[PDB]
């Protein structure tokens, strides 16, 4: 019956502010402390802040102290996280979590129930097509690729030889850089004997910018 619903997440520019909320039901909200926990994409859980049942005690992680404030409005069964001076390092899914302990100002845990989270992505970037660079064969089987760099937003899709080449192809998940732009790589393994004869071209589609790029990948000058 316990349910927790976060909201208020979205795209925000660095330095700006944003206010997350977490609505609670199925238990006496008035009797329990509440935590905020965040998780950067593909990373570990990071505890953010805690507040006691009546808001008398609040504590913060060092990474957010001074910039984030936690509060609650017991009349609306809602927990809030006020985020200020946002940086790219704050990009994460933000979870609210109920503390197990009944009416106490000690907040030692455990985290009892979790919401499903709200995504906050802090980026100053606008719609931008990608730059594509070759990953040429050098050092039989050979790995070739093209590096799809500095685009926004997701997604980018990649094919090889206009789709004719499928065996051995893997396109990796994107990476989010400091600058707020995405990058990825697509790879394919080839017989080395074909490198001198067969043409290899990766086809990069970025519909959000209405940009298609075909990049020829040739062997390196040594």
């Amino acid at each position: 019956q316990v349910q927790l619903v976060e909201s208020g997440g979205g795209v925000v520019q660095p330095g700006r502010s944003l206010r997350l909320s977490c609505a609670a039901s199925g238990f006496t909200f008035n009797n329990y402390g509440m935590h905020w926990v965040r998780q950067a994409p593909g990373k570990g859980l990071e505890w953010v802040a805690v507040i006691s049942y009546d808001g008398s005690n609040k504590y913060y992680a060092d990474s957010v102290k001074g910039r984030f404030t936690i509060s609650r409005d017991n009349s609306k069964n809602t927990l809030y996280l006020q985020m200020n001076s946002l940086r790219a390092e704050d990009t994460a899914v933000y979870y609210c979590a109920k503390d197990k302990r009944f009416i106490t100002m000690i907040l030692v845990g455990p985290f009892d129930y979790w919401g499903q989270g709200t995504l906050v992505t802090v980026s100053s970037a606008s719609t931008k097509g990608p730059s594509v660079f070759p990953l040429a064969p050098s050092s039989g089987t050979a790995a070739l690729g093209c590096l799809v760099k500095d685009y926004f937003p997701e997604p980018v899709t990649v094919s090889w030889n206009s789709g004719a080449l499928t065996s051995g192809v893997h396109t990796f998940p994107a990476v989010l850089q400091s600058s707020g732009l995405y990058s990825l790589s697509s790879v394919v393994t080839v017989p080395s004997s074909s490198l001198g004869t067969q043409t290899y071209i990766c086809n990069v589609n970025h519909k959000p910018s209405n940009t298609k790029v075909d990049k020829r990948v040739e062997p390196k000058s040594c």
Partner: protein, 213 residues
Amino acid sequence: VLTQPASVSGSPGQSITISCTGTSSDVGGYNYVSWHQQHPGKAPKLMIYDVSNRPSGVSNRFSGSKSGNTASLTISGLQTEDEADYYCSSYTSSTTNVFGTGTKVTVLGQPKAAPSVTLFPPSSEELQANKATLVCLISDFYPGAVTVAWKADSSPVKAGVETTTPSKQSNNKYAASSYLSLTPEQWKSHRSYSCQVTHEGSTVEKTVAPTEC
């Protein structure tokens, strides 16, 4: 500050243990250690609290214990749906709460495979664009959990590293990618760079040099 193994694996039906190593301020100072299970694309769920208690509805094959500054979660009779990320957590002296680094638990469902590593130096076209990315592509490994370390010459490098979390390939083995972003000056100012990938307690290292091809 709580240290967990990056990867723990076992065959179906077997018993595994995940260690959580903290300090006299964390795991050693209080009996407030918890364990959380997180399946892909979902929210954590409490498995064990106060070192060794189980919420009702949590299978009794999960068990928690503590000794000194090290807490331990034990999963008996491994089942495929036990495959998830596991995090320990504890109250600290700093009147905060901290999570462990996290452990991917793999229930072995295919043969183990050591990673194949290919390291790409920056392309001439990228350097002419006044950028330099080293691309370390890790493929054909199982279980799908690696840790990547970078070296410039022989000393480690932590600034500018980005690593994807492993996902399955066409051949249903795992692949991951790691990037070292540096300036073209940085690239030429060193003798060699190395990508080291640790997998199942063993490390494979590949090295590129600006003067080779």
